[PDB]
Amino acid sequence: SSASLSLSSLPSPSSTSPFATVEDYMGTNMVFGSPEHVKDSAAVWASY
Amino acid sequence: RKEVVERDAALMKKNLSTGRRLRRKVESSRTHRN
Amino acid sequence: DWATQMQRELFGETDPLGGQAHKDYYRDPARGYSPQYAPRNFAEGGAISYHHAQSPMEYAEATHRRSWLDHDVARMEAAFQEQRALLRGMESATERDELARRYAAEHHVADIVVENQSLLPSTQVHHSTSTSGSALRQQAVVDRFQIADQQSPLATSDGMGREELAHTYRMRSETVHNDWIEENLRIVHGLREKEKYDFTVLQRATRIPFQGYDMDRFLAQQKGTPYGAQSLPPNTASSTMEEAQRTLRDPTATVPSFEAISQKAFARNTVRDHPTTGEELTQEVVDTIRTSREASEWQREQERAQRFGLGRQGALVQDGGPDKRTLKKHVNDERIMDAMFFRSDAYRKTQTDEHWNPYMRQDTTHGVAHLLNNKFDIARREDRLSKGEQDLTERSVMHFGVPIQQTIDEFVFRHRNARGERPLD
Amino acid sequence: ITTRGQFNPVHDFTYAMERGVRARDEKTFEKLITNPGPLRIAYSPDYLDWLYRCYKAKGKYMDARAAAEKPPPGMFLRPPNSFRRLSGEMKRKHAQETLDEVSKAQGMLDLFERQPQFPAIHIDRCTRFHLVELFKEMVLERSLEAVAIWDKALLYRAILSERKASYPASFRYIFKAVEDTVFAHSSVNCPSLEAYYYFLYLVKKYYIDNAVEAHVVLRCHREPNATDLLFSNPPPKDEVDVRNAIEALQFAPPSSYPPIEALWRCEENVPLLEILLFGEFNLIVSENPFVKFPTAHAFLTRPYSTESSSLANVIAEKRGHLLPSFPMNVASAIDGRAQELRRLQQKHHRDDTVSFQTLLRSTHVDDNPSTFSSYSDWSYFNPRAVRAEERDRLTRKGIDALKEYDSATEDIYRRSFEDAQASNFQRVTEAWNTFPPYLPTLPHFVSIIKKDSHISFLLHVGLPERCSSAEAAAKHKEFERRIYQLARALYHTALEFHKETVRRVNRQKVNVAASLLDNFFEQEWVAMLRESESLENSLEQGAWPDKKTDMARRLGRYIPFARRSLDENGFPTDARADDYARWMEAPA
Amino acid sequence: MVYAVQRPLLFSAANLAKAEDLIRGVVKNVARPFGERRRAKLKQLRANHRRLATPVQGVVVSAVVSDLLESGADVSEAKKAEKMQESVTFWPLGARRVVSYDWPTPHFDALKRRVAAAGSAVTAQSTKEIQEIKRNAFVEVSLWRRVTAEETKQRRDAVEEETRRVADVVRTIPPLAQVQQYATSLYQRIEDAAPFPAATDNNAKSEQEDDESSWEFVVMLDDRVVLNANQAAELYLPYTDASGVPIPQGECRVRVRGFDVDVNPTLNPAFCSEAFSTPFQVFDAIPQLVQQFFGTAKPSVAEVSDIPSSKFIQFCAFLREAGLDVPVQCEFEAGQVLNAEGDVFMEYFLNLLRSDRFHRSCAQAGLTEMQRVIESSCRAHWEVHHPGANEAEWAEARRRVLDRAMEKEREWWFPNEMLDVTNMSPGSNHGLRLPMYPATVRYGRELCTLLAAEGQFDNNSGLSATCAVNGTGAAESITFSTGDHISSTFSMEEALAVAKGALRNAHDRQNTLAAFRLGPLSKHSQVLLFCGINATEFGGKYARTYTYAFEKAKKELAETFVSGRVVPGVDEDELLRVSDKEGVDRFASSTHPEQRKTQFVPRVGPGGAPIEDPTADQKTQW
Amino acid sequence: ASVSQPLSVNFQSSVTVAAPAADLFRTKVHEGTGTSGKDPYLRTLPNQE
Amino acid sequence: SFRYTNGLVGALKHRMMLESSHRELVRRRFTGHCRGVEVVCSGYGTVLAVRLVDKTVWEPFYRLDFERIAESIKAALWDATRKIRSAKEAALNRSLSHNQQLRAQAHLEHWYDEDANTLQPLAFEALKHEAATPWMQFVQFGKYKHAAAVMHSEGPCVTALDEKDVDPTSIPIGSVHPLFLPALIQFESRVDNSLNDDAIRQEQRREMSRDEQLFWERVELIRKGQVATI
Amino acid sequence: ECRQFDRCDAIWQELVDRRWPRASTLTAELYLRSIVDHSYTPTSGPLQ
C-alpha cells in the first residue's frame, strides 16, 4: 500500500512453481525449508 | 473421533441457543423517527 | 404504454415496488429476492401460478447466471445513467416519455412479459382471467437484470465447484444405490411378488369396459374432442394465500444450505442477545456451517443404518457369540444387506464372470450394454431407437409374450365365465 | 449478508482498537460513535445498545487474542511459518478483509437507504460545497425529473414549515435555512412564491407530514386525476378554506421554473438545498402510506390482482376465426368459470395481503434463521429503497468469501499424524476408488450436442455465415439458444436424477428443449438443403466437391434429441427402451 | 530419521522449484527483444499515421473552474474569458484538474453543429443522434513522467545483469540453450504481426536528440474520453498507480491520443493522433499540508496522530484551498474511527484518501471490479500475445482487451471454481484430491474443446480474414474483409493465403487462451501427484504392481498382433504351457465335486444348469 | 391403471398399499411394475416381429 | 483374485493403444475438400496449407465472389477437422472393441467417456507440441536418449516421430498414462526411457520396512492388552 | 440382424426350393450362423 509497502512483504517463496511449497501434513520442511521453517520442523517433529 | 463429535455438538448448540435480547420501542412522530 | 412506464420505473434508482410488501408479487431467491409478479390462479384454486421450485440447483444456477450477467448489468446501469440525464434535461412531458418509449422499444422490453400462446380454450380461460395479458402486461415489474438477460452471450458453465460437484455426485449416486438396495430388499422379502399377486386377485371383479360403438367416437367423446364436447377443469376447493405461500416460499427455503445457513445465522445476529459483527461473526457463521455439514452427513449415515437396519443389535459380547441377531418378517437388516450382496457378487471378478454360458449371457434384464460389443452395434442401436423400431439388441432375448388366448382364458376363469359378457344367444 | 431488518454497523472498530483506543464509558463511546463533519448521524437506541454490545464483544475479543499472542475439535496446529499455515493466514486474512468491506458497505447502504435503526441523518457543519456534493450524489443523482426535484424543493419546505412545531430543539437547525429562502428575485436563480404556495396549500389540505406522503403526492400531485388518486382514507380539507388560510399567511400547478442546475449552482438556493437534503435525510419516517391513500397504490406501485375483481368471446377472439367458435354450452361454461374466478378473487382480495404481511412478519418476530426474509420487505414504504441488485452484488461477494474462509481451515489446522498415516494406508485407485471422468456438467452436455456431426455441421457449415447478414446473427443466436436450451435441461436432469419426480420434470424440460431444437433442425437443415438452387444450374458436375451432394447429405439421417434416449450421464440409455420410457414418463 | 525420509522427495521438489524458476528466467529475458522490436516498429508506424490525420496540437491542462456560482451569477455567460487558466504549472498527487484538447475532427463537428443548432429545446431525436456522434471517436489522456538517463543507465545495468545471469546458467545447463531457442522461435510465431504501410526512416542527420531525458509511462489518467461541448474532461490523479507502488514526485505532461474509429478499427496504437502538452511537475502534498495547517516542526512531520474533530473540517476545506481534492464521503468514512478524545486518526483518514475505496480514475473505475479479478489472466495472456511488453502497452490496451475477452471469450477468462486454484501453497491437499483429478483433466479439456477463439489477419494487400476456430480446429465463422479498393482482385491461392493467416492466428490465439485457462490445475495436480505418490495406486509400495502390470500389458498387446486381436485366453486357455498359466484352481478341494462353490450352496442358472464348475459343453465363446 | 390401495371391504383390504414403482430400477423383460397399462405387471405382447 | 491387477492390465492396454493412436495421428496429415478447396491440416488441427484444384473447375462457380469462397474454405477445413476427429474416435472404437478385459468389465460408458475432444492429441495443446524444437519434442514425447543425442549437437511435429514410436508395445510409462506422468516420472529412468528399477524397488522396500515397524508395534500392544485383560 | 429367425428359415427353404440362383457358400454360412445365434437366443422367465 501507500502505507504498508514493507508491511506487505510477506515470507513467500517468489515463484510460479508450486514446488516451493512441498511439506508434509505437518507443514514442516527439512529440505529447502527456511532457516526458521526447519527450526519449526525440528521442534515440532522432535516434540512428536 | 467420538469426542470431537461432542465438541461439534457443543459448537452448534452454543450457536443455535440464541437467547433473546430485549427490544425497545420509540414513540412515533408523524414527522420524525424519534 | 405499459412497457413505457415500466421502463420509466426501471430508469429510477428507486425500488420498482418501493420494497413494500405486495401479495401478488413474490420475492424469488432465484431472481435474488426480486419482486417477481405471480398472482394466484384460482382456475386451479389458491395455487400461486408461479415457478414452484423443485431443487436448490435452480437457485445455484440462478446465482451463477446472475454473477455472469452482473458485468452486463454494470453496463446497463452505465447507459441508464446517461439516459436518465436526457430524461431530466427534457422539460416537455410527452417527449420526456417518448424517449423511454422508443428506448424500451430498443432494449426490447416488450417481449419479457411472457404472454401465453395455448389456443386450447380450457387452459386459455385458466390463464387469461387471473394471469391474463391485461394482467401481466399491465402489472409487470422488470428489474435491471431482465434487459441484460436479452442482450448477453450465452453461458456455458454452472455455479458448481469441485468439492461441490464431487459431493453432489456422492449424494446422487448414494441415494440411487440406496434406493436400488431397497427395491431389491423388497424383492428378497417378496413384497413386489405380493404386489403382483394382489394385482390378479383384484382382477377378479373388474368388468370389461364398454368401449362404445364407434370406438374412436367413444374415445373422442371421452377426450371431449368432437364439436360440442369441450371440457373445462373441474373446479376444486380453492385454498388461501396462507397455504399458497407456505407451499411456495418453503421450496425456496430449500435453497442450498450454504446460502441458507450463512444468511440464517447472520440474521440471528442482529436480533440475538450477543450480537457481534466482523470476524467474530463470520467465524460463528462458518462454524455453524461446518457443524451442520458434519452432523448432516452423520444423520444420513443414520438414515442408512435405519432404512437398511445397519448396525449391530444388542451387545457386542452377548454370551452367544458377537454376531447374535434376530431377523424380522419383512424388515431390512444388515445380515440381509451382506447376504443379497454375497448372493449376487459372491467371488466376482467382473459383472460378466458368469457370462460364459450363452443363456446366461444374452439376458437383457439389468441393461443391454454387455451385448453391444462394437461401435456399429450401438450405432444401429441408437439410429433404430430414433426411428422408433424395436431395438435390435433388445430382441437378443426371445420374450414369447403372453398369448391373447391365455389372457382371455384367465379372465374368464377369474370372472366365472364372463356371464355378463356373452351374447344373450 | 443482509436481511429485511438487519443491523450492519458502519463502524470500523477494528482500526480504533488496532491503534489502541479502548472504550469503556458510555459518553466516551457515544462521542466515539458520531461523525464530526458535514454528516452528523444518529442511530436508533436498539442499534445503539446493539453497537455498544458490538464494542463490548470486540474489545473483549481483541483482549483475548492479544492475551493469547503474549483449533477445531480434531484439527491441530502445524508449526508456524509453514507454507500451508501461512497461506491459510492468507486466505483467512483476505476473507476477513473482503468481509470488512462487505459489512461496512452494508452499513453505509443500510444507512443511506433510510432504514429504521438509522433514524436521522444530520448535516451540521455542512459547507455549501458539501450541500451540493451530497445533493448531486443522492438527489440529483437518484432523480429522474428535473421538474419533480424542483417540485420537491418547495413541497418539502412547505411540509417542514407547516410542522416546525413537531421537530425537537435538535431538528430546529434546518429552520434558519428554511426561513432565509429566496423567492421571486430573478428568473434563473430561484422559483417564485406561487410554487411555494401551491405546495403549502396542498400540504395544509392533505395533512402531509412524512416523506411517505411527500413521495406519493409528488407522484399524484401533477396528474389531472389527483382528485381520486390522492383520495385519502380520511378525506382532506376543502379548497375554499385552505385557500383563505394560504391567503391569510400570504390551486393551479407551478410550471415556471429555473433550470435544475440553478438548484445546485446558486449561491442563494443553498438554504433551499439544506431543506432538500433534509427531507431525504431527516423527515423520512417509516409509515405505511396506502392505508391513508387507497388509490395512489395502483398507480405508485403496481395494483393488486384480485382488486380488479364474455370470457368465451374474448378467448374466441384470441383463438381467432380459424378455430370454430365456442358453441352454446361452452360459452356459458367458460363464463361461469370466469365469474366464479372473479367471485373467489372478490373473496380472497384483502385477506391475501394481510396474511402475506403476517407470514413475512413471523420470520421477523422470530429470533430464528431467516427463511422468508428479504433485503427490503417492510410492511411500509421507503421510496429511497436500494434495489435488490445493489444489495445482491455484495451479498454474493461476501458469500464467496465466506466459502473462502471455510476453505482456510485445512491450511491452518491438521488432523492427527497417525490418523493421516491411516488415511494414506488405503491407496487411491483409478480402477476402483475414483470418481468417473464424465461429470454431470453443462459443458459436458453442450459438448454432446457439440459432439454431434449434424449440429456441428449446421453451426459451422450449415447455417449461413453469421458475419455477413444481421439476420444470420439472430438465426445463429437462435441455434446456439436452442442447443443451450437442451444443454441446461440435460444438465438439470443429470444433477437431480435420483429425485423421483424432479428427475421426471427436468426430463420434461429436456423433451421440450430438444423438440424445439429438432424442429429448428428439420427446418434450418432443409433450408441449407434448399440452398442448392445455386448448384442445380448447368455446372452439372463441378466434379468432386459439392456441398450438399454430398458434403452435407453424406452425414445421413438425423437423430432428434427429444427421442434420443439419453441416460443420466449424458450418454444413451444403457437401460432398455421400455425401462427408459417408464423412467421418463410425465409428472402427470 | 524424518530428515532422511523427507529427503528423497523433497530434494527432487527442490530441483523442480529451482528449474521452473530457471526456465522463467530464460523465457523472461528472451521475451524482451521481440517487445523491443514491436515497440520501435509501432513507433515507426505512428510516425507514419501522423501524416494523414489532423492531430491535437494543443493539449492544455487547467485547474477546475469553480463549478458553483455567486448569488447573482445568472445562467447568462458564466463561462467568461477571464478565469479560464490557459495552462498550468503543476498537479499534486491528490489533485483534480480539467484537461482539454484541439480536435477539428469531422465527428467533433458533427457534435458541434448539432450542439449549436438547438439549445434549451432538447429533443429525443437530438439526444439519440448526439450520443452516436459522441461514440465514434474517443480521446485518451496519458500522464507520463520524464526520466533522465541516470535511471536508464541503471535499468540497462539491471537488464544486463539479468542477461549475464541467464547466459551463465544457459551455458551451464545445455537444456536451457534449446529452451532459449524454442522460446525465441515460439515468440516469433506468436507475435501479432504488424506489416503496415512502412513509414519514413529516421534520417541520420535529422535525428530527434532525445538522449537527455525521455518521457516515460507511469499512469493513464483516463482511457475513453467522450466528446463534449466545452471540450473537456475533469480528471483526478490517483495517488497510487494500478500497480501498488505510489507515484513519487517528478515532472510530467499529458499526451492525448486521439482515436478516430471512423478511421481506426481494432484500435491499433499506431493509427491514432497523439500530442504533447506543457511539461510540468507532480508531487505529494499531504506531509506539507498537515504541517502548514498545524504549525508543527520540520523533522517531526510524522508526529501528528489523530485529527482534533473541530478544526478538521477546516483541515479538509484548506486541503481543497491549497489545491487537492477532498470528498465528503471519504471524510465521513474516516469519521467512523474516532479517538478517546473523539478525534479521527491520521493513519485511517490518510489510508482511505490514498486508497481506491471511493474515488479513482475513470479508467480503472470503468473496468468492472468483476474484471479486476480477471486482470491477472487477461494481463498475462496478453503479455504472451504481446512479448516483453512494459506497463505502457498494457495500460494503453487494457480497456479494449479486457472488454473483448469479456464480450467474446467470457467463459474463457471468467473465474471457474472447478478450474481455479485460489491458493498456491495449500491447494496440494485443498483443491485437487487424489480421486477427483482424472475428472478435472477431462473437465478442463471439455471446457477448452467446447470453447473457441477469434483470430484475424491481413497480408496488407487489401483483404483481411477473421476466424472463430475451436479446440477442434474446425471453424465456426470466417470473414473475408475486402474493405479495400475495388481493384483488389485477389488471386485464388492469394485469397487462400489471407484465409490461411487468419486460420493460423485463430488457432494460435486459441492455443494460448487454453494454455492459460488450464495452467493452474495442471500445475497443482502436478504437485499433488508428484508428491502424493505416497498415496496413489502406483506409488510407495504398489508401484512395483503398476509397473509390473504395465509390462504384462506390453507383453499382451504384443500377443494381440500375433493372435489377430480376438478375445484372448479369458481363463488362460490358449496357452500351450501350464507353467505359463498364471490362472489357477481356487477351490477348497480339487477332487471333491461339492466344495467348488462360490457361495454356500451350488448355484444353478437358467433352467438349472450347474454353474460352479462350467464344463466345456455348456461354455461357448459365441 | 390402478393402485394396491386398501379399501375397507374384506376383499380390497387384503391388498396392502404398495410403495410406488422404484424410481431408478432396471426391471425385467416380462415384468413391469404396474403403474400404467403400457407398463403392466406382466407385459403381454412379445418382442418378436 | 487379482481383479485390481487385471483391470490395471486392461487400462494400460487401453492407454497404450490410445497413445499409439496419438502418435499415429501425429505422423500424418489430413485434408478437407468441400468446393475447390484442399485444406491440409496437422494431427493437432493446425492449418498446414489451403490449396485449390489443378484444373480449378469451380472457377465458373466462384467466377471472386468471396462468400462462397469463405463458405467452402471453412467447410473443407471443418471437413479435415472432422476427418481427424473421427479418426481419433475410430482409433478408440477399435481399442475398446479389441480390449478383452474392458469388454469383460462390461459397461456402455466405456465407448463414451473418451472422444476426439478428450483423447490425448488435442487442437489447443497444439503449439506446445508442434512449434517445439528437437530436444523438447524428444523430452515431451519421452525420448531422452534421442534428446541427449540432439543436445550433443509450420507445425513440425513429424520431426521426432518414427514408426518405432507408434508401436504401442514399446512407448514408456509417462506417455502410456499421461494423466499420471508427473508421478510416474520417478520411475521413468533418465538414460533410457525404461523403468527405473532401483527407484521402484527401493521405494517399495522403504515403505515395507516402515510398515514392518508399524506392525510389530501393534503386535506388542495387542499382546500387552491380552496379558492385561486375560 | 433383426433376429427374424422365422424369415431366415422361410428364405432358406425358399432357396432349397428354387435352386436358382445357387446358394454361395457365404449364404450357407449366413444361414447356419443365423440358426446358431438363434439357438443361443434365450427365452423368458416364465419359460426358463
Q: What angle do CA D112, D115, D120 make, to 5 degrees?
A: 75
Helix axes D146-162, D193-206, angle to 10 degrees: 60
Evaluate whether D189 touches D227 at the Cβ level (below 8 Å).
no
Q: Compute the distance between CA of residue A10 and CA of residue A12 in angstroms, rounded to an integer.
A: 6
F30: nearest CB among H4, H7, H44:
H44
Q: Which three cell numbers stand for residue C258?
A: 450454504
Count of all residues that appear for chain F in the document: 49
Chain discontinuities in chain D, listed by preceding residue (C to N exceeding 2.5 Å):
70, 250, 309
On the question of a cis peptide bond just before residue H21, with omega within 30 degrees of 0, the verdict is yes
Nearest to D210 among B1, B18, B30 (CB): B30
In chain H, how many H helices and how many E strands? 2, 0
- Comparing CA positions, the residue from G180, G161, G178 lying closest to residue G25 is G161
The CA distance from E111 to E116, in Å, is: 9
What chains are in contact with A, requiring at least 3 Cβ pairs below 8 Å? D, E
Q: Are E142 and E257 in contact (CB under 8 A)?
A: yes
Grid cell in block for residue E486: 475495388
D74 touching B, CB under 8 A? yes
Number of CB atoms found within 10 A of residue C302's CB:
12
Q: Beta partners for E250? A: E282
Method for structure elucidation = cryo-EM
- DSSP symbol at G158: G
Rounded to an integer, what distance in angstroms lies between the CA atom of residue G228 and that of residue G225?
Answer: 5
Evaluate whether E238 touches E220 at the Cβ level (below 8 Å). no
Contact yes or no for C258/C289 (Cβ under 8 A):
yes
Q: How far is CA E47 from CA E273, E405, E531, H13, in A?
A: 10, 30, 55, 92
- Name the interface residues of C facing E (CB cutoff 8 Å): 67-68, 70-71, 74, 82, 86, 89-91, 95, 98-99, 102, 153, 155-157, 159-162, 164-166, 342-343, 346-347, 354, 356-360, 363
- How far is Cα D120 from Cα D116, in angstroms, rounded to an integer? 9
Residue D369 has phi, psi (to 5 degrees) of -55, 135
Name the phi and psi angles at E399, rounded to 5: -65, -55
CA distances to C252, E518, G23, G93 from G119, rounded to whole Å, are 42, 16, 12, 12
Compute the distance between CA of residue C157 and CA of residue A24 in angstroms, rounded to an integer. 35
Contact at 8 Å (CB) between E417 and E427?
no
User: Which has the closest alpha carbon to C269: C259, C280, C260, C253?
Assistant: C280
CB D234 within 8 A of CB D195: no
- The span from the CA of D229 to the CA of C299, in Å, is 58
Question: D41 touching B, CB under 8 A?
Answer: no
CA distance E435 to E525: 11
Sign of CA dihedral D319, D322, D323, D324: positive
Residue G139 contacts by C-beta under 8 Å, 6 or more apart in sequence? G147
Give contacts of D 118-177 with E, CB under 8 A: 125, 127-130, 132-134, 137
* G 74-103: CB under 8 A from C: 93, 97, 103
CA atoms of D196 and E538, how far apart (whole Å): 87
Residues of H in contact with E607 (CB under 8 A): 48
End-to-end CA distance of chain H: 24
| Spatial distance between the Cα atoms of E411 and E399, rounded to a whole number of angstroms | 18
Cα–Cα dist E226/C82, whole Å: 12
Give the closest residue to E496 by CA, choosing from G176, G226, G69: G69
Question: What is the interface size between A and D, counted as CB pairs within 8 Å?
Answer: 47
Amino acid at C43: A
Residue G222: which residues within 8 A CB-CB, separation 6 or more?
A: none
What distance in Å separates the CA atoms of residue E58 and residue E55, rounded to the nearest whole number?
Answer: 9
CB G100, CB E570: distance < 8 Å: yes
Q: If you write DSSP's letter for every residue of D438-462 in order, what string do you get?
A: ----HHHHHHHHHT-HHHHHIIIII
* Secondary structure E strands in C238-303: none
Q: For cell 508543527, name the residue.
A: E296
Residue matched to cell numbers 424542483: D150
Find chains touching chain C: ≥3 CB pairs under 8 Å.
Answer: B, D, E, F, G, H
- Name residues whose C-beta falls within 8 Å of residue D524's C-beta, 6 or more positions apart in sequence: D458, D462, D463, D475, D479
The separation between CA E425 and the C-alpha centre of its own chain, rounded to angstroms, equals: 22
- The residues near D351 (Cβ < 8 Å, ≥ 6 apart) are C240, C241
- What are the start-end ranges of the E strands in D115-221? 120-122
DSSP state of E419: G
Residues of H in contact with C380 (CB under 8 A): 1
What angle, rounded to 10 degrees, do the helices at E492-530 and G67-97 form?
40
D121, D130 contact by CB (below 8 A): no
Spatial separation of the C-alpha atoms in residues H25 and H16, rounded to whole Å: 14
Distance of CA D140 to the CA centre of its chain: 22
- Chain H residues contacting C, CB < 8 Å? 1-3, 40-44, 47-48
Helices E437-450 + E492-530 axis angle, to 10:
160
CA distance D243 to D201: 7
| Three-class secondary structure of residue G87 per DSSP | helix
Hey, of D574, D579, D580, D585, which one would you mutate to test binding to chain F, going by the most F CBs within 10 A of its CB?
A: D579
Q: Which of E146, H30, E205, A44 is nearest to D414 (CA)?
A: A44
Cα E227 to Cα E130: distance, rounded to the nearest angstrom: 10
Residues 6+ apart with CB under 8 A from F5: F15, F17
Longest Cα separation, chain B = 61
Cα distance between residue D76 and residue D410, in whole Å: 10
The SS3 call for residue C406 is: helix
Cell of C259: 446460502
With touching defined as 3+ CB pairs under 8 A, do chains A and H touch?
no
Q: Give the helix ranges, DSSP H, for E50-195.
A: 106-117, 124-133, 149-172, 174-190
The residue of chain H with its CA nearest to that of F31 is H45
Instruction: Report the Cα E402 to chain-centroid distance in Å.
Output: 8
Between chains, do C370 and G105 touch, taking CB under 8 Å as contact? no
* CA D106 – CA D102 distance, rounded (Å): 6
Q: Which amino acid is at C64?
A: H
**Cell numbers standing for residue E282:** 507532480
Rounded Cα distance between E542 and D433, Å, is 15
* Helix, strand, or coil (residue D427): coil
Nearest to G4 by CA among D425, D430, E569, D437: D430
**Are C400 and H2 within 8 A, CB to CB?**
no
Residue E565 and residue E575: Cα distance in Å, rounded?
15
Q: Which of residues 439-468 of D touch E (CB under 8 A)?
A: 439, 441, 443-444, 446-447, 450, 456, 459-460, 465-468
Helices (H) and strands (E) in chain B, counts: 1, 0
DSSP string, E67-81: SS--TT--STT-S-S
- Strand E213-225 to E137-148 pairing: antiparallel
A38 backbone dihedrals φ, ψ, rounded to 5°: -65, -30
State the Cα–Cα distance between residues D480 and C252, nearest whole angstrom: 30
Query: Do residues E94 and E324 lie in contact, with contact meaning Cβ atoms separated by under 8 Å?
Result: yes
Angle between the D239-249 and D193-206 helix axes, to the nearest 10 degrees?
130
Burial-class residue E571 by CB neighbours within 10 Å (0-12, 13-18, 19+): exposed
Q: Give me the count of residues in chain B.
A: 34
Torsion of CA G198, G204, G210, G216, to 10 degrees: -130
Across the interface, of H1, H43, H47, the residue whose CB is closest to C392 is H1
User: Can you give the C-alpha Rg of chain G in angstroms?
Assistant: 25
Q: Please state, in angstroms and rounded to a whole number, the distance separating the CA atoms of residues C8 and C6.
A: 5
Distance from CA of F39 to the nearest CA of C (A): 13
Query: Which among C349, C355, C375 has the least Cβ separation from residue G93?
Result: C375
